Design a protein around this nucleic acid. Sequence first.
RNA 1: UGUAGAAUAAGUGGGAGGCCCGGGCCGCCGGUGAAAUACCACUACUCUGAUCGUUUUUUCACUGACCCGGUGAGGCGGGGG
RNA 2: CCACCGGCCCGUCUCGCCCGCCGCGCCGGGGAGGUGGAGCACGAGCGCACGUGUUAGGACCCGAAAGAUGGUGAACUAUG
RNA 3: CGCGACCUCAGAUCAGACGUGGCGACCCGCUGAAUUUAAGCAUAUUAGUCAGCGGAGGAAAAGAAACUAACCAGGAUUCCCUCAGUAACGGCGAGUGAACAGGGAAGAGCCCAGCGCCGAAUCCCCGCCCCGCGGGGCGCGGGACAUGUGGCGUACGGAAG
Lengths: 117, 203, 48, 217
Amino acid sequence: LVENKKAQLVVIAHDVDPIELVVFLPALCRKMGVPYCIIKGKARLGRLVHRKTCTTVAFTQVNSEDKGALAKLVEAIRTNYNDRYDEIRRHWGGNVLGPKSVARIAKLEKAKAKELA
Amino acid sequence: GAYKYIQELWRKKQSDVMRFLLRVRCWQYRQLSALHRAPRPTRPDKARRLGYKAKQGYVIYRIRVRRGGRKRPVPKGATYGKPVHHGVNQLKFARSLQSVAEERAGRHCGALRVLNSYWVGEDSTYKFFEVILIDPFHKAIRRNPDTQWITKPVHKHREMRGLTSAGRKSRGLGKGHKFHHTIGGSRRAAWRRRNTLQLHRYR
Amino acid sequence: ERRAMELLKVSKDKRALKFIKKRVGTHIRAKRKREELSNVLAAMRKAA
Amino acid sequence: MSSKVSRDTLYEAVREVLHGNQRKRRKFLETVELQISLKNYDPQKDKRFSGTVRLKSTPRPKFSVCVLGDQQHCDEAKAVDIPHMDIEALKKLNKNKKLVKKLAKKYDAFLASESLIKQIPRILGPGLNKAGKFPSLLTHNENMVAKVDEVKSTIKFQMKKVLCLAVAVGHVKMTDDELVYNIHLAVNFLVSLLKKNWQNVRALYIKSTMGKPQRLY
RNA sequence: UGUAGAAUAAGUGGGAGGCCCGGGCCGCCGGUGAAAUACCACUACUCUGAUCGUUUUUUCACUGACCCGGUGAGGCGGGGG
RNA sequence: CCACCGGCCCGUCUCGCCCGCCGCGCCGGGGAGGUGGAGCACGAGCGCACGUGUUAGGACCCGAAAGAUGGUGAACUAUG
RNA sequence: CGCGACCUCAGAUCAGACGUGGCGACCCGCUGAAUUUAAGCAUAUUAGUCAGCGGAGGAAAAGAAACUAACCAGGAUUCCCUCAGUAACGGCGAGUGAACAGGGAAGAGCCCAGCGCCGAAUCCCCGCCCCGCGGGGCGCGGGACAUGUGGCGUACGGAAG
Ligand SMILES: [Mg+2]
Ligand SMILES: [Mg+2]
Ligand SMILES: [Mg+2]
Ligand SMILES: [Mg+2]
Ligand SMILES: [Mg+2]
Ligand SMILES: [Mg+2]
Ligand SMILES: [Mg+2]
Ligand SMILES: [Mg+2]
Ligand SMILES: [Mg+2]
Ligand SMILES: [Mg+2]
Ligand SMILES: [Mg+2]
Ligand SMILES: [Mg+2]
Ligand SMILES: [Mg+2]
Ligand SMILES: [Mg+2]
Ligand SMILES: [Mg+2]
Ligand SMILES: [Mg+2]
């Protein structure tokens, strides 16, 4: 549906343990213009689909009342994900040392402050 | 629709997105045991094109082997033979390591039948395979008559007679000018027909 | 690929294709890999 | 790094180097210069270039040629009015060393009869062989018409031991087609000597007498 | 920077004029040696000088792979008293 | 049938000039000698069986000290 | 802090089912010598065989070209006669040693992953009837697999709409 441009809103679950099952989808939805949102809890998508794991939810077709609520969601989701994609694509997450080692380097930095001033 | 993207993302495996996942999974599989039962495949499409249809009865084992060509088991480097055979350190052992993993998985669980196997990881010494196993006596496979061939009893322990994908590639069988070494069936059958000196009643 | 793009960016196609012939199999695949990297590098750093 | 020997890129560089600074027009009739810079040679052992290139259009000056000898050869020399000097005044040239170079600089190309080449490196010794202008040996009763006709157009391709050679290929009052044809007759000696290709030339420069340099495209 | 030449001659080759505002300077000539400059182009070493970089070597350093010890894995690191 | 000469084919070598033309050429074909050939110069093989001889096979029969593979023994003896 | 959802997991004399051991003449996978030969002996040969190990059935293995060929072209696999003691390998020594053309015997082709279309239209387990024997198979309600992908339509000879 995202290739043939039928999808209005793509919901992607967070916890997919082989992440190769997902990692094409953000750049693909970015190219095809469909807004996508990353939501936490792949089991939480299962309780609406009567199943354990769901991994993805497509929105293509809306009722009469829900159109204004869906557009109100799509605006904030385009504010978060799609329009900040060129920002997000260059961040390297992680690289966080252990808190004991961080505390030791900070204590040595206070020792450097004691040496200087 | 999406397994094409799965396969292509797994295809160029030396890029920076995938090799992080590969390094994490190599550490993950090295810290566990040698043979255990993964609940679900880690390469879904590649396991699926070997025959994994995710229903009741298709088991996935993860199995670990050690690298390196085999060392000849004679003690203290003593071959007791001609200078042809003194080479203790350098033999490669014809069979492939994938078929070694298939042999170990099958004979550890001899109740099952081996369908195929594939690669999932390597770091220095340990090489990691995943082996699909088909249950012979579950009713979901004893029905559905496209699948009854493995329930037919001539396929007990395919891995030790070398009928799998890596088994055929180790036995070395194809067609044409690059395969006259085994003209029919196997190299021993070819050797049998070529050196069986044939004699008729009338000569 | 990344260091071949630098070598084919600045220095010389002869040294670049000799490196590609060392890294992948033979000369024909080296030709296609060279032409693909040249097209990608041309598109990137002539797309302004 | 790119280099062709193509005709229109030769002729366009000729037009550019003529039209440089409008017409860089001064009171002398400008001559056209060619520099050849060469690559991957070792003339330290066995790679020196030295030949006779006869430029087909025009070699600027009708060359100042001096011939030394005596016969019907020297009667034809006096017929063409080639400046010719006899045995007694050769033994007069013996007496001073600067008197050698007074006839060597004023007269460019040197031709000498077969009979006198035993004597000439005794009288004209320090000048001609060390400066490069040792005379050419001739036939004892040669038709001097074709000899002087070829010597008027014959320059020498002498790359010596150095890596580079400039030659004058004519003047700018010539037609530019004759100029680019002289440049082709210059580079033909390169492609005739060298075995592999013209890739020893990464860049050759086309210039006027004092105009800006143009790399050959 | 062997020697000579007013002048540390790296080399080739064009070369009678060039540079500029009737004119001066440089070159030609003289003179050197074996090879001579102006004006013009390239080819080289001998060092200096900066970074899109580049690599490997070296220097220390961190820990998360890996390894070494001990426990019935028993109080560890920060911050409060 | 024997002996010799002459002839012919193929490979090479030497000396020579002429012809051909689905295309005029570092193209074909040819001549005359002297040589190498298991050749031709009106063909005699093939199949079967028997005999003799030779060779490979355990091969006329028996014969070693050895070597390899895979196993069984410390109840005598050796030492903890 | 509690509860819930998964995901990784363990336990059970849990409900039901399965594998082990043998015979090994033939077959399949690996491993693997040495006597001998060469008048000696190191490569070669004996041989990828004896021994060893693991497997299997009434047959197994092979198999519907990533083929053979190079001309008027054949067409999955298997087996026989020829090819042939040949091309080839080899202290180019002893020795080793194929294959396609040809003629026969037998005749057989197929499916799935991918791709997309069909509202998961699919399967397993439990419980009640259904039915007739010598003995077990379709249908109706609730517990699961499964959307990280059951089933139908589908295979390179093109296929779908
Ligand atoms: Mg399961
Ligand atoms: Mg098969
Ligand atoms: Mg017979
Ligand atoms: Mg012996
Ligand atoms: Mg022994
Ligand atoms: Mg033993
Ligand atoms: Mg005892
Ligand atoms: Mg003997
Ligand atoms: Mg012996
Ligand atoms: Mg062998
Ligand atoms: Mg055996
Ligand atoms: Mg058994
Ligand atoms: Mg049986
Ligand atoms: Mg096919
Ligand atoms: Mg025969
Ligand atoms: Mg053999």
